Structure 1
Amino acid sequence: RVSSGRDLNCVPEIADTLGAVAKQGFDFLCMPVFHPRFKREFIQEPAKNRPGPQTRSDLLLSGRDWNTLIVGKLSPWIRPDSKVEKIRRNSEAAMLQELNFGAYLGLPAFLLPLNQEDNTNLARVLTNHIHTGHHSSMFWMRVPLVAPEDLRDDIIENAPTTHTEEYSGEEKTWMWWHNFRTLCDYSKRIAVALEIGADLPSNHVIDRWLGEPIKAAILPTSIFLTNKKGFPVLSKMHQRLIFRLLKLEVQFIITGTNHHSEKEFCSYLQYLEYLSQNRPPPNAYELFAKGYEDYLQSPLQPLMDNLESQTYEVFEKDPIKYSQYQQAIYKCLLDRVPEEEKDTNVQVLMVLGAGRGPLVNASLRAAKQADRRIKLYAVEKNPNAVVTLENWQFEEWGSQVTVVSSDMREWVAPEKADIIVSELLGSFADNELSPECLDGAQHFLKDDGVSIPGEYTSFLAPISSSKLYNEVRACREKDRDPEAQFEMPYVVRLHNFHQLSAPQPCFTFSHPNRDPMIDNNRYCTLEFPVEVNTVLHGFAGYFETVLYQDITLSIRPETHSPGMFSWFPILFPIKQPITVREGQTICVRFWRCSNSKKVWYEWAVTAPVCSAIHNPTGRSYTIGL
């Protein structure tokens, strides 16, 4: 089900037009609130005193209809950045007038064009209008994917179109947007309506809009090809672009008249619905994950905090992860106990951080799948989850499982363990302090004991996402540093973003850590080659982990465990976006620091330009020990 609207510059009667576009199947209508040719004067008499009414009445539609179905359009004669001072001031007044009439109508969105490089005065007027009464209405900047100057026919004899490659020039319209939104100070009420032409640009020009707040995509009827039956269709590259935009849940705007005059108009829209019903289907669980797209959450700290029941429920609703854990335990049991000792050798397994006991059941299934005897300790410091563990033990497990309600760094074990099993891993692998916990638990592991996971490694990748940058910026809270939200990571299903370089390993931890002086602090320098023009807003973080031998888990996109979803990626933002030109290298520095009470991360960009060192001394974000 696509959400779509009709763009019209000609509305004789608003009710008839709205009924027609609704019968055609459109959800809303982009229309002018003043007649597009009704140029108005604000300074010079006598035209300054033109008798009203200046436009049609608000009584023509219900307030519900204004709020839900009408998208206002700026009149095409309003040029706030005209080289003529008269036209400049008059267009300032007219733009204020039309924006204020749109706000008076309660319109949910208002379309303004970005059809040239310089829109400084347009941005000034729009920013002044935004800071005049708090409203939630949106402003869709109509930006062409290719500027009309670079799209014209090569039919001007003495002004030929350049056939020479202009890598940055072909991205010019993005800059048009990037400057504008920068002038307006990244207002959340300003989004992109990307207009798509008949000739698509290079792939880098299209990827330039990844991570941008695209709320609408404008499809002219002229870009549609024609099939045998005469129905309007799109080229395969246009279908690629439509699929990409559908993954962003954008609203599609159909502009232009019907050039397939044999068929109904809805044909156009129907094709999109067709394209929407035959898109590559997602994962079955990706619907609950769809609602989390670009949703910022603070990282869970299961050590410092006691997790809630439904958090554990989410942890357990992942059969792939526990299948991998069971297979790892099965392989380890087969490797440690030969066949002749299968009835004499009882392996000591200790689930460190048992929660409600999914790893306990995994260990039991692995033991009776490997045909080996095990003795289980389910260690958990969360007493609320210990309630669940002990009810499980009394009702089902029995004396085979011994439930321990203690911190694994304090618990005096009655015997040493053959295998310790844990899932103390966060989105950034070690950001839940699994190294420290498993270090404190190492002394009751046998000299040849095995830790599952045996290893884990975090990965970082620079990303571009003005949307996620603005979402982080909006997380300002009172009674704290106005920029603290930038100095803390967020667990988030990254969606509308652009990965700028391949992920590289950051921090690696092995278990057991048989080493004289264990130091879990880390300092890492990463050089990311960037082959696109872009804007760095932060770093995505993933992790891989070796549970046992070739049994692994991974949320690293290139090696992501298929069908596993109990871990979203992490996001380390930066205070200031950093312009990165094609060919440059993003150099990032990441620290894992600690004292007796807390562990934290510090990070900084050092190339192509230096950022501030983020979260120094854990002032904005710490992980409690």
Structure 2
Amino acid sequence: RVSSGRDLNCVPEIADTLGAVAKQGFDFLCMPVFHPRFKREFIQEPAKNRPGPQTRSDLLLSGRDWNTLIVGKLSPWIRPDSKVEKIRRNSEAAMLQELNFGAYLGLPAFLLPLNQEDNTNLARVLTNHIHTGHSSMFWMRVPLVAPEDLRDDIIENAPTTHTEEYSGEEKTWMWWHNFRTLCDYSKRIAVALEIGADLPSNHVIDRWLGEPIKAAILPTSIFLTNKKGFPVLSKMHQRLIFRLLKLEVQFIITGTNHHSEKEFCSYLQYLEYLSQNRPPPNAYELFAKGYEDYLQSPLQPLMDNLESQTYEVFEKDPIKYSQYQQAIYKCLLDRVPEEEKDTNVQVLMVLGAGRGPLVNASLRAAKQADRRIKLYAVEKNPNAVVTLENWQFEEWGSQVTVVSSDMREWVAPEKADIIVSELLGSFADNELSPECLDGAQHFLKDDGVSIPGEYTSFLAPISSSKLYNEVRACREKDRDPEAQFEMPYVVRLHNFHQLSAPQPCFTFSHPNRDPMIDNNRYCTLEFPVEVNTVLHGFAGYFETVLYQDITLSIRPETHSPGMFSWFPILFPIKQPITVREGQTICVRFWRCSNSKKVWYEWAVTAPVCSAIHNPTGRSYTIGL
């Protein structure tokens, strides 16, 4: 469950050591590749001609081990941003040397510290190494709380501050931010976040939401002792561990054993212990375990036909169809007086019937309602129609009338009491439910019900340097180099930070009595942000009224429990935008159309402007 590693800064013999930590129960070892104290000279004679060997041999471990077990560590004396030119130049050469040796050995990751604000020349060297020769990773060791801000207040003529600086307390994030910005958001550069005895304010911790945390470093010192004598953690430290277990980081144990009566596996046992003691995963969880932050480009249901296995997956949503069953059930009772039980057969039409889940839910409804119904099942996907007709003949009988048609084209024999549809995307109107039902409503009785009756989309600003970087990695040949940022993705948002409460964006209701129907939209939203952060896009959710008080939602606050049929959507922006605590994010959203296609455009106007994204649907449209 818990992948973990031992950090050492003293290794007399690699094999002895590596066995010891393997024995102890660690999965890997962080260690120096040159001796930490073995300062080397590159310019100045005579010291530069120091006879080799300059370090240990690669032959001391199997390639297998180097690749899987050994995380390298930059030697602590290497200071690329030293104020002394000599040291700067020397450290440059030393850093390159140690990095190349890591690469030579084929190490899966290598550690470099961020110990101060200025790491410019350090970044320059790293960047150059990155662009020279792999999928090797760099772990930047960053303190959650800079050493200077956790020192003992024992310098009598230099007291530790006792006034809060909000932004000052977040300086280590800025160290990281500047560094990764300088390095052009290389995907080979991640964080090893170092945790101290005293934790900062939650804002300082939430600052790391959405950041690529690959490891969390735990000193032995930060462990309380229980009555038995075992090592444990404060409840606050535990909260953090559980947060970190969602991000499935590798935990790194550093420092000597202070619980000497206990073993060093006792520390690791505490983690293993917490890991099962993690609060059980909810119903929506255990779904999207493997879809976390996985980006999917939404595809037109109208222009393309869904595959068999796609339908298969979404048919098996317990809640969606329960809710659909109930809405239809309640609507029947509202429509047919008990006295008219046998006199009145209601005309139902499933519009987009697929493999017939709403058909069945409609049958299960009428059985329970003790009312009589005539079904049409209208489906444009002719492949699915084959499923319907095998169903219909085998089971349903002539009660169902499979119509193989677009609902906008079909000429109905009679009007419907109830049209029932399932055309909503993750952002409600994104699959063009409005346009379809509009073209179909002519065959609704002048007093008929559409299920669903209404839907509303919701937006919320988010920070995720991770998701931002994944989108960025979606450049493709033979199209605009920035097209990937001007289109929405479906994604189980996971490593991210919501910067303000979701707010309604666009709403549609059916039937739409308006004489002049227009499905285009323009919407300005104002998102009050109470943190320092970096904006990278907007999450999209939706809610719908199926009937009366029967609803579905993926809006996190009101999310329908268990329902997996929709992940959130993400609308990225080309360039991230700094937001200071207090500021309002103002976003603009258009729904646009012509006769052939529908699309969204969007822009941020406060606290700075973005470009309008997806102008004229140049990067992205949905085919009518």
Say whether the 8 Å CA contact 2:284–2:561 is kept in structure 1.
no
3-state secondary structure, aligned to 1:375 = strand
3-state secondary structure, aligned to 1:343 = coil
Alpha-carbon distance in 2 for matches of 1:292, 1:166: 39
Corresponding residue of 2:566: 567
Alpha-carbon distance in 2 for matches of 1:75, 1:204: 32
Is 2:13 the partner of 1:13? yes
CA deviations over 1:494-531 (Å, ceiling 9, x no partner): 00000000000000000000111000000000000000
Say whether the 8 Å CA contact 2:492–2:568 is kept in structure 1.
yes
Shift of 1:300: 3.0
Alpha-carbon distance in 2 for matches of 1:332, 1:300: 32
3-state secondary structure, aligned to 1:288 = coil
Alpha-carbon distance in 2 for matches of 1:287, 1:62: 37
Corresponding residue of 1:388: 387
CA deviations over 1:583-618 (Å, ceiling 9, x no partner): 000000000000000000000000000000000000
CA deviations over 1:330-349 (Å, ceiling 9, x no partner): 00000000100111100011
3-state secondary structure, aligned to 1:286 = coil
Corresponding residue of 1:442: 441
CA deviations over 1:366-388 (Å, ceiling 9, x no partner): 00000000000110000011111
Shift of 1:315: 1.4
**Aligned positions, number:** 624
Alpha-carbon distance in 2 for matches of 1:498, 1:146: 20
Corresponding residue of 2:45: 45
CA deviations over 1:311-343 (Å, ceiling 9, x no partner): 111211211000000000000000000100111
Corresponding residue of 2:620: 621
Alpha-carbon distance in 1 for matches of 2:223, 2:520: 58
Corresponding residue of 1:350: 349
Normalised by the length of structure 2, the TM-score is 1.00
Corresponding residue of 1:64: 64
3-state secondary structure, aligned to 2:534 = strand
Corresponding residue of 1:127: 127
Say whether the 8 Å CA contact 2:325–2:364 is kept in structure 1.
yes
3-state secondary structure, aligned to 1:243 = helix
Alpha-carbon distance in 1 for matches of 2:313, 2:597: 26
3-state secondary structure, aligned to 1:290 = coil
Alpha-carbon distance in 2 for matches of 1:423, 1:315: 11
3-state secondary structure, aligned to 2:360 = helix
Alpha-carbon distance in 2 for matches of 1:161, 1:56: 43
Alpha-carbon distance in 2 for matches of 1:442, 1:431: 19
Shift of 1:299: 1.0
Corresponding residue of 2:465: 466
3-state secondary structure, aligned to 2:407 = coil
Alpha-carbon distance in 2 for matches of 1:89, 1:386: 72
Alpha-carbon distance in 2 for matches of 1:285, 1:84: 56
3-state secondary structure, aligned to 2:287 = helix
Say whether the 8 Å CA contact 2:301–2:431 is kept in structure 1.
yes
Shift of 1:148: 0.2
Corresponding residue of 1:197: 196
Alpha-carbon distance in 1 for matches of 2:599, 2:314: 24
Alpha-carbon distance in 2 for matches of 1:56, 1:426: 58
- Superposition CA RMSD, Å: 0.6
Shift of 1:284: 5.0
Say whether the 8 Å CA contact 2:283–2:561 is kept in structure 1.
no
3-state secondary structure, aligned to 2:286 = helix
3-state secondary structure, aligned to 2:348 = strand
Say whether the 8 Å CA contact 2:320–2:563 is kept in structure 1.
yes
Shift of 1:244: 0.2
Corresponding residue of 1:222: 221
Shift of 1:285: 6.0
Alpha-carbon distance in 2 for matches of 1:156, 1:390: 85
Say whether the 8 Å CA contact 2:8–2:255 is kept in structure 1.
yes
Alpha-carbon distance in 1 for matches of 2:15, 2:502: 54
Say whether the 8 Å CA contact 2:378–2:404 is kept in structure 1.
yes
3-state secondary structure, aligned to 1:67 = helix
CA deviations over 1:263-322 (Å, ceiling 9, x no partner): 110000000000001101113563341100000001132111101111111211211000
Normalised by the length of structure 1, the TM-score is 0.99
Alpha-carbon distance in 1 for matches of 2:37, 2:316: 60
Say whether the 8 Å CA contact 2:283–2:562 is kept in structure 1.
no
Say whether the 8 Å CA contact 2:380–2:404 is kept in structure 1.
yes
Alpha-carbon distance in 2 for matches of 1:310, 1:84: 64
Say whether the 8 Å CA contact 2:463–2:535 is kept in structure 1.
yes
Alpha-carbon distance in 1 for matches of 2:441, 2:320: 24
Say whether the 8 Å CA contact 2:193–2:216 is kept in structure 1.
yes
Alpha-carbon distance in 2 for matches of 1:461, 1:270: 40
> Which 10-residue stretch deviates more, 527-536 or 295-304?
295-304
CA deviations over 1:207-264 (Å, ceiling 9, x no partner): 0000000000000000000101110000000000000000000000000010000011
Alpha-carbon distance in 2 for matches of 1:313, 1:280: 31
Alpha-carbon distance in 1 for matches of 2:406, 2:494: 37
Alpha-carbon distance in 1 for matches of 2:526, 2:282: 34
Structure 1 portions without partners, runs of 5+: none
Alpha-carbon distance in 1 for matches of 2:116, 2:388: 65
Alpha-carbon distance in 1 for matches of 2:258, 2:96: 35
